[PDB]
């Protein structure tokens, strides 16, 4: 039976104890075990009735199921979602995650697995501390809890509890022989999670329990990441602890001052200037043992400035904010080394701030430096290219000139990122193949928007040649979307999703200029989709042939001139005339169609199914292939 089990699961989810008893009445032991312990797929969850009853917190339901019927403690199934789709979790894990003391107490008294390990070794203690119920954590503790059992990423309950803002649970774990020196999969400790959380009480309890501060696998000590996250309170605690020496504390002060000028949430130039006072004074208070910071060459994005080595230069910027933000970014790169992922969001946000008030000259170079850092860090950067396309379309719409070297550099980074995404999806796993393909298609679309912008702007012959070479590299690479669409097919398709922020105001697809430029760059005119539609099949189905007759006419002219079989057949044996919805496109193609005896003879050969293997040249062997 399936209906009775489904109704039992639904009643357990709803808490209908009378209905549950009615459904479970007059049932044998096998029937009792089948109705309680059957995995049902409801609401996106493959769960047993006991799992959904423990998750809902129904104490009466779970106690009836475990007392009168004695449901087994091996209720394994998929529970919850949003990064917590772990399968095989027992009812105790769900009860601890649900944050109901009565349910976990009843399950423990009934013999649930306290240290149960899931497919990702998710212990119930981790879920209990994630929910924040101290009583559940304790009740798990006295029932032979294993604090060594952690996630497969070496994430213990203490680390994830310190990540959240709950001091009571981390204090109870620390007094219950925790592991303050824990090391995660990335090398980060729970001290880093506490520092980025901004709760100084957790750090105080950790250092009271021999926290033993140390850098992570990447190389970011917790004081440094606390400084980067504008957590001044967390920074001003290790000085009281008195174990950060003098160079680490002063670079923490410098990074804190640099971060307050760039972080959007904690944007306050006053705090930046105050902590820069603190950094300068603590550097220049002794003289004999003066601590000096290194000098990096100036970066063209921030103008021409290398920190403020003389303090009087720092106090010379108390009347300005732009140079203060640039100095903060310079100091942030000097400390972080311009290699962590944390160096890109500040400069990107500064570029955005320069962009909202039409100061595009600084925004473009700031975002270009951020994009170069992202590319040199081997990080996904499709969003940065998308925002480049957006800002380029915005400044195009405002009738302001786009710098040709700027768009050339963006195109270079775009084709490099498309190569990176192509080789990433070449050997990607099934768990991430959909998102990898989505990123690849987003990179393709943003490349198309950039090419459309480059057609929109006016540049010299050298800049146009550079842009054409950058496009031709990708054209020779021959990128294909999940539907088999090449660059030409998307450039001639009206169904290409143009971004809604600013690109849709300028980049309109299909566009005659982008297709003409792609053909000049050597696009394969006779390409196919997965269903065989060439560029001509795609364009002839265009929805606005009257108002946009110029675009459709130019696309068809360019496609025919570059060489396109105007009677090529897709998998459904439909010529572009047979695929053309509008009569305007039909007659445009007929004007651009040249009668040929080779096509007529190939059509006759295909219709009569004459065997053309080795009887004709290979060129004809494919000519009848697509006719």
């Amino acid at each position: 039976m399936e209906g009775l089990a489904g109704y039992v699961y639904k009643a357990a989810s709803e808490g209908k104890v009378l209905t549950l008893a009615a459904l479970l009445l007059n049932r044998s032991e096998s029937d009792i075990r089948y109705l309680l312990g059957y995995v049902s797929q409801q609401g996106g969850q493959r769960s047993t009735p006991l799992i959904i009853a423990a998750r809902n917190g129904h104490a009466k339901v779970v106690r009836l199921l475990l007392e009168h019927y004695r449901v087994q403690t091996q209720q394994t199934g998929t529970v919850r979602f949003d990064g917590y789709v772990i399968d095989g979790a027992t009812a105790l894990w769900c009860a601890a995650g649900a944050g109901h003391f009565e349910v976990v107490k009843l399950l423990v008294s009934h013999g649930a697995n306290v240290n149960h390990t899931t497919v990702t070794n998710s212990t119930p203690l981790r879920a209990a501390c994630f929910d924040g119920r101290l009583d559940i954590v304790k009740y798990l503790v006295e029932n032979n809890a294993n604090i060594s059992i952690a996630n497969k990423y070496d994430n213990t309950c203490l680390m994830i509890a310190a990540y959240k803002g709950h001091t009571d649970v981390v204090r109870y774990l620390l007094e219950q022989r925790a592991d303050p020196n824990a090391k995660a999969h990335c090398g980060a400790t729970a001290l880093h999670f506490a520092a980025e959380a901004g709760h100084i009480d957790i750090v105080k309890e950790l250092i009271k329990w021999r926290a033993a501060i140390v850098v992570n696998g990447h190389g970011m000590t917790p004081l440094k990441v606390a400084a980067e996250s504008c957590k001044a309170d967390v920074v001003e605690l290790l000085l009281s602890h008195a174990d950060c020496d003098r160079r680490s504390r002063i670079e923490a002060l410098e990074l804190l001052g640099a971060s307050f000028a760039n972080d959007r949430e904690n944007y306050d130039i006053i705090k930046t200037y105050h902590y820069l006072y603190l950094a300068m004074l603590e550097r220049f208070q002794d003289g004999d043992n003066i601590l000096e910071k290194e000098v990096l060459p100036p970066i063209h994005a921030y103008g021409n400035r290398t920190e403020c080595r003389n303090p009087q230069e720092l106090e010379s910027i108390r009347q300005d904010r732009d140079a203060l933000h640039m100095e903060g970014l310079i100091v942030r790169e000097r400390i972080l080394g311009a290699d962590n992922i944390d160096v890109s969001h500040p400069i990107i946000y500064r570029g955005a701030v320069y962009a909202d008030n039409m100061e595009f000259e600084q925004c473009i170079k700031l975002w270009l430096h951020a994009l170069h850092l992202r590319q040199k860090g081997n990080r996904n950067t499709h969003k940065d290219l998308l925002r480049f396309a957006q800002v380029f379309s915005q400044m195009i719409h405002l009738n302001e000139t786009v710098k040709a070297p700027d768009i050339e550099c963006v195109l270079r980074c775009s084709v490099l990122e498309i190569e990176q995404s192509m080789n990433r999806v070449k050997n990607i796993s099934d768990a991430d193949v959909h998102n990898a393909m989505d990123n690849y298609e987003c990179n393709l679309y943003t490349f198309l928007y950039l090419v459309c912008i480059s057609t929109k702007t006016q540049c010299s012959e050298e800049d146009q040649c550079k842009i054409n070479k950058q496009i031709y590299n990708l054209i020779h690479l021959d990128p294909r979307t999940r539907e088999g669409f090449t660059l030409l097919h998307l450039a001639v398709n009206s169904n290409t999703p143009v971004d809604d922020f600013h690109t849709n105001d300028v980049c309109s697809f299909p566009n005659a200029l982008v297709t003409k430029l792609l053909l000049d760059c050597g696009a394969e005119v006779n390409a196919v989709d997965n269903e065989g539609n060439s560029a001509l099949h795609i364009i002839v189905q265009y929805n606005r042939p009257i108002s946009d007759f110029l675009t459709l006419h130019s696309i068809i002219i360019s496609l025919v001139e570059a060489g396109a079989h105007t009677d090529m057949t897709n998998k459904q044996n439909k010529t572009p005339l047979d695929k053309s919805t509008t009569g305007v496109s039909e007659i445009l193609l007929k004007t651009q169609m040249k009668m040929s005896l080779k096509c007529l003879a190939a059509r006759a050969v295909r219709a009569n199914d004459i065997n053309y293997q080795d009887q004709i040249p290979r060129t004809l062997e494919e000519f009848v292939g697509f006719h």
Partner: peptide, 10 residues
Amino acid sequence: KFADHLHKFH
């Protein structure tokens, strides 16, 4: 404004 769209990855 461009500052609003940055909250996604950060």
